RNA sequence: UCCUCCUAAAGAGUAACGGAGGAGCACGAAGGUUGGCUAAUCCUGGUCGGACAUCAGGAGGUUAGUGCAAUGGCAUAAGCCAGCUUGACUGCGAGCGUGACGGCGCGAGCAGGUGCGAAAGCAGGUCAUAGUGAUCCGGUGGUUCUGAAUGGAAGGGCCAUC
């Protein structure tokens, strides 16, 4: 199962970040509408979220679910986090290879202020 | 001569015979021999009792043995000093607690059943009593 | 041909639930991981659990496998 | 006659300010390849004589 | 105990060396690990020797 | 002498010429890190091929495996595969466990300099528990520390190691 394999892949990282006790930037990727979220160390609340599923961010990019979409979401999370106040975060692959859209989102985020 | 096959260990501790019997009810036949006393039965005693009943019933009915030795017992050779390791295994015994059902039987009249069990109990070292299958 | 044995390794729980410990103190000595490290608890190379912070030690059961965890709260 | 110091003892223990004794650790002479650096490192510094055997050391070197 | 002990000598002029073991029967070639030399306080190549 | 289980009486420890077995290693990788993967046993179809080679599907969920006997542990895998590597590093070390002692074990963290990863991070050997021998005497390399009139040297000391 794709989901079961993915959860098994990301379990070690999630546990490592959980015991470390640090805010983590978690990204969920699908064939469309790449998501992104910021989670408190306790893991119970979401500091801020962004994605291409809402019209506020989906009204510019031609198509959601590409490199451009990842950069927009990656950038979008940036100023939101900077405005909120949190600066340092830990990136979570969530079992997605850090190659394409995931890398583009992270690259946009780190260059936008969320260094990690 | 009941005996296990390829037991895990050749020797085992003496242990104790405290407690109370578990198989206290007739489960296969209609009549059974219940153990009143406490002790151990060797393989030879079980065989002797079994032969006594089979002859008594004249190979009529069914016989169930509800006890297995599964416990080796050692014995030092004559003119041997204490120590120098555990003794060699000689015979196998089954620990019996009060209420244990030794033998079960079915397919014969109650009258013939009583004498058959009485003959067997005469060749056992523990007080025994005759019981009948209960309804629930 | 018997008669051989090994010196006892004095394993077991050294600090029990609800008693304060200092950082670096050994909590449990074990061969495997009968208890898993929780919060402010580190695991040694020999699966020894030691306190990484000062506080009260507590035991709990967590996870889908109901495996036992040892944590420390700063109290 | 005056007491004779145990010369062998005098070559292995040195007296300190508070009456203690310092000695070299006794496992760092040879067969060192198979030893971890951590264990060799900890044996390098001098150590104090234990209480139990302190009384024995006092008798051996009553003058020093 | 076929495995025998060797000495790793730093490529630098310093006389510092490491000691280890190896099996000459299976891996007869020299050992060229890159280790830390505290005399010069740098990581340098260490060569196998007696 | 050392290791594992039981005896051992639910903390630790606990004897017998009591009951069972092992060790005197191995590995520059079988170590470090990063990425990925998940067995045994059965059922059905299929050339040699056959109960038991390899292929496909299904039940199964670890009865597999874990370099070596046993116990405990291991899916975040400690099990299996691949890339890059030498942290199997130096000086330390709060605080603990264990011993009559000699001693043995665990260890966050600090300084220096490294490897893997985008990064958080991990790495001071190996899933852990056996694979080991005090001191004396002497050998090898470094270090003006000392060097008995002086300058050297011999010989000692210190460090690494046999």
Swiss-Prot record, chain B:
Residue numbers of N-methylmethionine PTMs? 1
Q: Which residues form the signal peptide?
A: none
SUPFAM superfamilies named among the record's database cross-references: Ribosomal protein L16p/L10e
Q: Which InterPro entries match?
A: Ribosomal_uL16, Ribosomal_uL16_bact-type, Ribosomal_uL16_CS, Ribosomal_uL16_dom, Ribosomal_uL16_sf
Gene Ontology molecular functions: rRNA binding; structural constituent of ribosome; tRNA binding
One of its GO biological process terms is: ribosomal large subunit assembly
Keyword tRNA-binding annotated:
yes
The superkingdom of the source organism is Bacteria
Residues annotated with (3R)-3-hydroxyarginine modification? 81
Q: How is it modified after translation?
A: Is hydroxylated on Arg-81 by RoxA. The modification is nearly suppressed when E.coli is grown in anoxia.
Query: GO cellular component terms?
Result: cytoplasm; cytosolic large ribosomal subunit
Keywords, ordered alphabetically: Hydroxylation, Methylation, Ribonucleoprotein, Ribosomal protein, RNA-binding, rRNA-binding, tRNA-binding
Entry-linked PANTHER family:
50S/60S RIBOSOMAL PROTEIN L16 (PTHR12220), LARGE RIBOSOMAL SUBUNIT PROTEIN UL16M (PTHR12220:SF13)
Task performed by this protein: Binds directly to 23S ribosomal RNA and is located at the A site of the peptidyltransferase center. It contacts the A and P site tRNAs. One of the last ribosomal proteins to be assembled in the 50S subunit. The simultaneous presence of uL16 and bL36 probably triggers ObgE's GTPase activity and eventual dissociation from the mature 50S ribosmal subunit. It has an essential role in subunit assembly.
What does the annotation say about its assembly with partners? Part of the 50S ribosomal subunit. Cross-links to the A and P site tRNAs. Interacts with assembly factor DarP(YjgA).
The UniProt family comment states: Belongs to the universal ribosomal protein uL16 family.
User: What is the protein's name according to its record?
Assistant: Large ribosomal subunit protein uL16
Origin species, per record, is Escherichia coli (strain K12)
Curated annotation (Swiss-Prot), chain C:
PANTHER family per the record? LARGE RIBOSOMAL SUBUNIT PROTEIN BL27M, RIBOSOMAL PROTEIN L27
Q: Which GO terms describe its cellular component?
A: cytoplasm; cytosolic large ribosomal subunit
Q: What is this protein called?
A: Large ribosomal subunit protein bL27
| Pfam families registered for this protein in UniProt | Ribosomal_L27
Gene3D superfamilies per the record? Answer: 2.40.50.100
What InterPro entries has UniProt attached to this entry?
A: Ribosomal_bL27, Ribosomal_bL27_CS
User: Corresponding gene?
Assistant: rpmA
The answer to whether the entry has keyword Ion transport is: no
GO-annotated biological processes: assembly of large subunit precursor of preribosome; cytoplasmic translation; cytosolic ribosome assembly; positive regulation of ribosome biogenesis; regulation of cell growth; ribosomal large subunit assembly
Q: Which PROSITE patterns does its entry note?
A: RIBOSOMAL_L27
Keyword list, A-Z: Ribonucleoprotein, Ribosomal protein, RNA-binding, rRNA-binding, tRNA-binding
Q: Name one GO molecular function term.
A: rRNA binding
UniProtKB/Swiss-Prot annotation, chain D:
Q: Where is this region: Disordered?
A: 1-21
Alphabetical list of SUPFAM superfamilies matching this protein = L35p-like
Q: Which UniProt keywords apply?
A: Ribonucleoprotein, Ribosomal protein
Which GO MF terms does the UniProt record name? structural constituent of ribosome
The UniProt entry, under InterPro entries, shows: Ribosomal_bL35, Ribosomal_bL35-like, Ribosomal_bL35_CS, Ribosomal_bL35_sf
May I have one GO cellular component term?
Answer: cytosolic large ribosomal subunit
**Basic residues bias: where?**
9-21
Could you give the subunit structure recorded for this chain? Part of the 50S ribosomal subunit.
Matches recorded under PANTHER family: 54S RIBOSOMAL PROTEIN BL35M, LARGE RIBOSOMAL SUBUNIT PROTEIN BL35M
The UniProt entry, under HAMAP family, shows: Ribosomal_bL35
Name by which UniProt lists this protein: Large ribosomal subunit protein bL35
Gene that encodes the chain = rpmI
UniProtKB/Swiss-Prot annotation, chain E:
Going by the entry's taxonomy, the superkingdom of the source organism is recorded as: Bacteria
Any single GO BP term: cytoplasmic translation
Alphabetically, the GO molecular function entries are: structural constituent of ribosome; tRNA binding
Recorded hits in Pfam families, A to Z, give: Ribosomal_L33 (PF00471)
What keywords would UniProt list here?
Methylation, Ribonucleoprotein, Ribosomal protein, RNA-binding, tRNA-binding
Query: Which cysteines form disulfides?
Result: none
User: Which PANTHER family did the record assign?
Assistant: 54S RIBOSOMAL PROTEIN L39, MITOCHONDRIAL, LARGE RIBOSOMAL SUBUNIT PROTEIN BL33M
- Family label: Belongs to the bacterial ribosomal protein bL33 family.
NCBIfam families registered for this protein in UniProt: PRK00595.1, rpmG_bact
Extra info from the record? Answer: Surface exposed on the 50S subunit.
What is its quaternary makeup? Part of the 50S ribosomal subunit. Cross-links to the P and E site tRNAs.
Q: What is this protein called?
A: Large ribosomal subunit protein bL33
Q: Which organism is it from?
A: Escherichia coli (strain K12)
Which gene underlies this protein? rpmG
């Amino acid at each position: 199962d794709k989901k079961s394999a993915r959860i098994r892949r990301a379990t070690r990282a999630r546990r490592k970040l959980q015991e470390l006790g640090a805010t983590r930037l978690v990204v969920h990727r699908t064939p469309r509408h790449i998501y992104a979220q910021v989670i408190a160390p306790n893991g119970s609340e979401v500091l801020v979220a962004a994605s291409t599923v809402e019209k506020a961010i989906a009204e510019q990019l031609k198509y959601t679910g590409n490199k451009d979409a990842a950069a927009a979401v990656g950038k979008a999370v940036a100023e939101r986090a900077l405005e909120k106040g949190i600066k340092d975060v830990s990136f979570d692959r969530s079992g997605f290879q850090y190659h394409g859209r995931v890398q583009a989102l992270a690259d946009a985020a780190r260059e936008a202020g969320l260094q990690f | 001569m009941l005996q296990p096959k390829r037991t895990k260990f050749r020797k085992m501790h003496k242990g104790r015979n405290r407690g109370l019997a578990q198989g206290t009810d007739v489960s296969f036949g209609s009549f059974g021999l219940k153990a009143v006393g406490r002790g151990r039965l060797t393989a030879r005693q079980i065989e002797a009792a079994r032969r006594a009943m089979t002859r008594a019933v004249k190979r009529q009915g069914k016989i169930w043995i509800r006890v297995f030795p599964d416990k080796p017992i050692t014995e030092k050779p004559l003119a041997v000093r204490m120590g120098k390791g555990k003794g060699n295994v000689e015979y196998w015994v089954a620990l019996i607690q009060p209420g244990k059902v030794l033998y079960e039987m079915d397919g014969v009249p109650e009258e013939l059943a009583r004498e058959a069990f009485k003959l067997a109990a005469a060749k056992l070292p523990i007080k025994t009593t005759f019981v009948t299958k209960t309804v629930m | 041909r018997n008669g051989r044995d090994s010196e006892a390794k004095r394993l077991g729980v050294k600090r029990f639930g609800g008693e304060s410990v200092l950082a670096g103190s050994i909590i449990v000595r074990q061969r495997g991981t009968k208890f898993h490290a929780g919060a402010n608890v580190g695991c040694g190379r020999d699966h020894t659990l030691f306190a990484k912070a000062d506080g009260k030690v507590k035991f709990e059961v967590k996870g889908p496998k109901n495996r036992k965890f040892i944590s420390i709260e700063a109290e | 006659p005056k007491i004779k110091t145990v010369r062998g003892a005098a070559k292995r223990f040195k007296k300190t300010g508070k009456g203690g004794f310092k000695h070299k650790h006794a496992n760092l002479r040879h067969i060192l390849t198979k030893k971890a650096t951590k264990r060799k490192r900890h044996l390098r510094p001098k150590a104090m004589v234990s209480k139990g055997d302190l009384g024995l050391v006092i008798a051996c070197l009553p003058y020093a | 105990g076929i495995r025998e002990k060797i000495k790793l000598v730093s490529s630098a002029g310093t006389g510092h060396f490491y000691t280890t073991t190896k099996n000459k029967r299976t891996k007869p070639e020299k050992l060229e690990l890159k280790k830390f030399d505290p005399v010069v306080r740098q990581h340098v190549i260490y060569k196998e020797a007696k």
